RNA sequence: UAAGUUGGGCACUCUAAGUUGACUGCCGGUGACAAACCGGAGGAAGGUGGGGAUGACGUCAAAUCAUCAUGCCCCUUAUGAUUUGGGCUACACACGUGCUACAAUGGACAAUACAAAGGGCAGCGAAACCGCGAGGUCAAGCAAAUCCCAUAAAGUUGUUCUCAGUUCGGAUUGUAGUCUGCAACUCGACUACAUGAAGCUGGAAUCGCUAGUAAUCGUAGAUCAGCAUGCUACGGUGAAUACGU
């Protein structure tokens, strides 16, 4: 289940890194930048949105 | 090489905001100065961003994205409290970075 | 492949020297993952949780190319139903 | 025979005449040519009496033997001694680290 | 004296000639075209400009030139011969226009896109 | 569809070899392909004295088929005269093709004694061509009242 | 001057803004005078220039309740929750996908020229010194056209090897070491030494490709406490043929 995890990824940890980066709204870890830190399908919905400084229209 | 100077740098993401707000802050500078440099160009550094049209399976249909950068490049020459303002004062729109320097 | 030196869970060492100085025991409750065997584990039963069941393992002195990293696997026959 | 420990092909140059041998392979073998001050020299068998006396008393200095193949059972015998489970994946095509195993059945057995 | 500049461009590179008539000699980048080109015996490829356009020559010339592979830039030499050419003289161009050497090619590598990988090599499919 | 020829390989002086070395050319490497060549056609010309044109010319001359089959639909296979391009590509094709059969441990005397073996009038790739001129121009029956 | 490193220069290249340009546009011929076709000139570029983004109504009750949201149904002192260890990596084998070989267009050593794009702040690690080596000390410069990654590689000049399971291949194993992480034992990566396997171009069957393509050589990025033969992206080199439906 995904609900505790999002405490686990939040509070202190023993060590350096027993971390990994998820997205803040989305629950999935996989996949994600830490340029902006957002999964791959909401990034790529919000970018949809024009929201996001930049592009998506690619074609380079 | 040693001179009196002023050096900005500016950043934005669409050319035709950051090209007139040069030529704006061009137009301040040379008001209360002279010797003003140009809006130099510079390299526009890109992104790319590799992503999957998918919620699943099928990584095959990807698609891709970028984020474009403008940056620019002006100097002036002979500085005065009045070229300081000509700067600080009007940067408007806000999408741009400007950073004032010496 | 430690260079910067060895690193016996601290917690082992604090329960085996007690368990050393006076007389030993036949039976041990640990973890041992994080440490190794050394000259000083010697003569002693420690026991590797393989992950169902702890085995006690009885410490010899010709452990050196071996250590106290693992003994009982857990794939445990085998997965696969021929033989090696 | 011949030249040095065994099993020397005559006529052969000393760089890679030296491999046959159980013990050298390529690096060790220019080490102590530069060591005796040997040639191939081209490519067939130049090596004088006069130098098959220093190579044959030089090549001691490594421990270059069927000793060798003795160490690494006696190696692996201790390491399957101990019921160890290194000794049980010595038999799986195994190495001390792993090599998951699902096709690795082709080169090993 | 006097000099002609043309410049070349050709598969990502770019070239800066300098022309000045004489008896004829090339060094690229302070260099002897031989002492660049690997191995390579094709710059009579690049003495056809002076052997169909100023018949037979020669012109003496100086380059200086960077950017991609050998072949690529020791053929955007040509390009800038024949402007040069054509700005000595427009007799030359009827000469050059009806065998080329003059129009700078316009094709170059191409992305890549799904189906390529590491080598330049397109997908199979699932049989059996 | 059309062609886009390769023009100038003035080495030697010549327009065959220019075609020819774009095939030797494995894996894009034309330096070693060029070198090869120069070295082997410089080779024949040291052996059984004589100059490179002459021994190439006539070489790739008994080794071009002229006549040629190709089949379509029963199976039957019309026989049909060849392209002086195609001529040239079939005959430099099989040529450099026997010369790998040939199976030599030089980088030059297997060419040398192959086109120099063809200046007889022998060898695989005149093989080749007797065994096409055999199968060829011997059933034109059925396939001759055709394109 | 080691040097574009500095005086200067902005001619050239380059850099990014705007335009100019290619739209059957002009001519000749064909063609129901039309559409349209063919040739020619011009031009850097002639018949949607090259490429990409874009995927019609709908079909496969295609996939996803495991991104998410959500109807209905089910669990709750547990079908929820915490931690340590194990496991997703097992092993008689089958298949897919790809990487490396089965070597004289080659093997090893020596010298040597030619890219583009991208990334980097608490990150890039320059020089120097140490070490065979992975790497270690050091600390300059660097929020970036500045400094670093970063020698580009193939390639070219040479020597040698002279057809062998080969100085081929580099699989397997052991030893000694390097870095990360607390810990590389089930499961990290890397170097040196030691071994040197199968394998001497592959059957039935089968895949991709019409020109910068294939073939082939390198590079960088993402994800990343450490780990990419995979992916994305970039450049290098680079042809054969398309008779014809």
């Given at each position: 289940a995904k609900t505790s995890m999002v405490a686990k990824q939040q509070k202190k940890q023993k060590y350096a890194?027993?971390?990994?980066?998820?997205?803040?709204?989305?629950?999935?870890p996989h996949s994600v930048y830490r340029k902006f830190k957002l999964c791959r399908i909401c990034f790529r919905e919000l970018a949809y949105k024009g929201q996001i400084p930049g592009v998506r229209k690619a074609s380079w | 090489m040693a001179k009196q100077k002023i050096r900005i740098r500016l950043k934005a993401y669409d050319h035709r905001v950051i090209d007139q707000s040069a030529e704006k802050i061009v137009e301040t500078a040379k008001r209360s100065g002279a010797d003003v440099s140009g809006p130099i160009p510079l390299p526009t550094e890109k992104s790319v961003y590799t992503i999957i049209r998918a919620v699943h399976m099928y990584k095959d249909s990807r698609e891709q994205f970028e984020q474009r950068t403008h940056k620019r490049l002006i100097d002036i020459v002979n500085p005065t409290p009045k070229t300081v303002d000509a700067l600080m004062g009007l940067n408007l729109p806000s999408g741009v970075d400007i950073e004032i320097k010496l | 492949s430690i260079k910067k030196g060895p690193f016996v869970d601290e917690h082992l060492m604090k329960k085996v020297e007690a368990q050393e100085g006076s007389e030993k025991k036949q039976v041990i409750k640990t973890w041992s993952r994080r440490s190794t065997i050394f000259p000083n584990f010697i003569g002693h039963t420690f026991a590797v949780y393989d992950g169902r069941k702890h085995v006690p393992?009885?410490?010899?002195?010709?452990?050196?190319?071996?250590?106290?990293?693992?003994?009982?696997?857990?794939?445990?026959?085998?997965?696969?139903?021929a033989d090696d | 025979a011949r030249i040095a420990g065994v099993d020397i092909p005559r006529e052969k140059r000393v760089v890679i005449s030296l491999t046959y041998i159980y013990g050298i392979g390529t690096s060790t073998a220019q080490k102590i040519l530069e060591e005796a001050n040997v040639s191939a020299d081209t490519?067939?068998?130049?090596?004088?009496?006069?130098?098959?006396?220093?190579?044959?008393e030089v090549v001691d200095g490594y421990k270059v033997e069927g000793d060798l193949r003795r160490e690494t059972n006696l190696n692996i015998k201790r390491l399957m001694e101990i019921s160890s489970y290194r000794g049980i994946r010595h038999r799986r095509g195994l190495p001390v680290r792993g090599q998951k195993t699902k096709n690795n059945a082709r080169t090993r057995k | 004296?006097?000099?002609?500049?043309?410049?070349?461009?050709?598969?990502?590179?770019?070239?800066?000639?300098?022309?000045?008539?004489?008896?004829?000699?090339?060094?690229?980048?302070?260099?002897?075209?031989?002492?660049?080109?690997?191995?390579?015996?094709?710059?009579?490829?690049?003495?056809?400009?002076?052997?169909?356009?100023?018949?037979?020559?020669?012109?003496?010339?100086?380059?200086?030139?960077?950017?991609?592979?050998?072949?690529?830039?020791?053929?955007?030499?040509?390009?800038?011969?024949?402007?040069?050419?054509?700005?000595?003289?427009?007799?030359?161009?009827?000469?050059?226009?009806?065998?080329?050497?003059?129009?700078?090619?316009?094709?170059?590598?191409?992305?890549?896109?799904?189906?390529?990988?590491?080598?330049?090599?397109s997908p199979q499919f699932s049989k059996r | 569809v059309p062609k886009r020829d390769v023009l100038p390989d003035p080495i030697h002086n010549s327009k065959l070899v220019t075609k020819l070395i774009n095939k030797i050319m494995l894996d894009g490497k034309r330096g070693t392909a060029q070198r090869i060549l120069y070295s082997a056609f410089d080779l024949v010309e040291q052996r059984s004295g004589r100059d490179a044109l002459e021994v190439f010319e006539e070489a790739i001359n008994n080794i071009m088929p002229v006549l040629e089959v190709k089949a379509r639909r029963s199976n039957y296979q019309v026989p049909v005269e060849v392209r002086p391009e195609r001529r040239t590509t079939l005959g430099l094709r099989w040529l450099v093709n026997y010369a790998r059969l040939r199976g030599?441990?030089?980088?030059?005397?297997?060419?040398?004694?192959?086109?120099?073996?063809?200046?007889?009038?022998?060898?695989?790739?005149?093989?080749?061509?007797?065994?096409?001129?055999?199968?060829?121009?011997?059933?034109?029956?059925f396939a001759h009242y055709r394109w």
């Amino acid at each position: 289940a995904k609900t505790s995890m999002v405490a686990k990824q939040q509070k202190k940890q023993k060590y350096a890194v027993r971390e990994y980066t998820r997205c803040e709204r989305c629950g999935r870890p996989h996949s994600v930048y830490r340029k902006f830190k957002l999964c791959r399908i909401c990034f790529r919905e919000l970018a949809y949105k024009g929201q996001i400084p930049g592009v998506r229209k690619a074609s380079w | 090489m040693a001179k009196q100077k002023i050096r900005i740098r500016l950043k934005a993401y669409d050319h035709r905001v950051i090209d007139q707000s040069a030529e704006k802050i061009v137009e301040t500078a040379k008001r209360s100065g002279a010797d003003v440099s140009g809006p130099i160009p510079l390299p526009t550094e890109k992104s790319v961003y590799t992503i999957i049209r998918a919620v699943h399976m099928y990584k095959d249909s990807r698609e891709q994205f970028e984020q474009r950068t403008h940056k620019r490049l002006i100097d002036i020459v002979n500085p005065t409290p009045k070229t300081v303002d000509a700067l600080m004062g009007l940067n408007l729109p806000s999408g741009v970075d400007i950073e004032i320097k010496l | 492949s430690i260079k910067k030196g060895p690193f016996v869970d601290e917690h082992l060492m604090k329960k085996v020297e007690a368990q050393e100085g006076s007389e030993k025991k036949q039976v041990i409750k640990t973890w041992s993952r994080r440490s190794t065997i050394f000259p000083n584990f010697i003569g002693h039963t420690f026991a590797v949780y393989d992950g169902r069941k702890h085995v006690p393992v009885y410490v010899t002195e010709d452990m050196v190319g071996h250590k106290l990293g693992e003994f009982a696997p857990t794939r445990t026959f085998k997965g696969h139903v021929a033989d090696d | 025979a011949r030249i040095a420990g065994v099993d020397i092909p005559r006529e052969k140059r000393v760089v890679i005449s030296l491999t046959y041998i159980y013990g050298i392979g390529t690096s060790t073998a220019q080490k102590i040519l530069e060591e005796a001050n040997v040639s191939a020299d081209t490519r067939v068998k130049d090596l004088t009496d006069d130098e098959l006396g220093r190579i044959r008393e030089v090549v001691d200095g490594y421990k270059v033997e069927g000793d060798l193949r003795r160490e690494t059972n006696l190696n692996i015998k201790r390491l399957m001694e101990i019921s160890s489970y290194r000794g049980i994946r010595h038999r799986r095509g195994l190495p001390v680290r792993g090599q998951k195993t699902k096709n690795n059945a082709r080169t090993r057995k | 004296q006097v000099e002609y500049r043309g410049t070349g461009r050709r598969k990502n590179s770019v070239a800066r000639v300098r022309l000045v008539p004489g008896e004829g000699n090339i060094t690229v980048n302070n260099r002897d075209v031989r002492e660049y080109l690997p191995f390579e015996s094709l710059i009579l490829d690049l003495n056809q400009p002076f052997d169909v356009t100023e018949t037979k020559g020669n012109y003496d010339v100086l380059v200086n030139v960077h950017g991609g592979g050998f072949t690529g830039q020791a053929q955007a030499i040509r390009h800038g011969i024949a402007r040069a050419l054509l700005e000595a003289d427009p007799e030359y161009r009827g000469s050059l226009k009806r065998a080329g050497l003059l129009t700078r090619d316009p094709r170059m590598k191409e992305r890549k896109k799904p189906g390529l990988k590491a080598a330049r090599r397109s997908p199979q499919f699932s049989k059996r | 569809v059309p062609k886009r020829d390769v023009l100038p390989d003035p080495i030697h002086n010549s327009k065959l070899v220019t075609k020819l070395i774009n095939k030797i050319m494995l894996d894009g490497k034309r330096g070693t392909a060029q070198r090869i060549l120069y070295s082997a056609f410089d080779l024949v010309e040291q052996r059984s004295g004589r100059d490179a044109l002459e021994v190439f010319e006539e070489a790739i001359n008994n080794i071009m088929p002229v006549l040629e089959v190709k089949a379509r639909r029963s199976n039957y296979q019309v026989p049909v005269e060849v392209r002086p391009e195609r001529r040239t590509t079939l005959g430099l094709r099989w040529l450099v093709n026997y010369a790998r059969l040939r199976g030599e441990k030089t980088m030059e005397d297997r060419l040398a004694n192959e086109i120099l073996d063809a200046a007889n009038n022998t060898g695989g790739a005149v093989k080749k061509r007797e065994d096409t001129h055999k199968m060829a121009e011997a059933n034109k029956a059925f396939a001759h009242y055709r394109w």
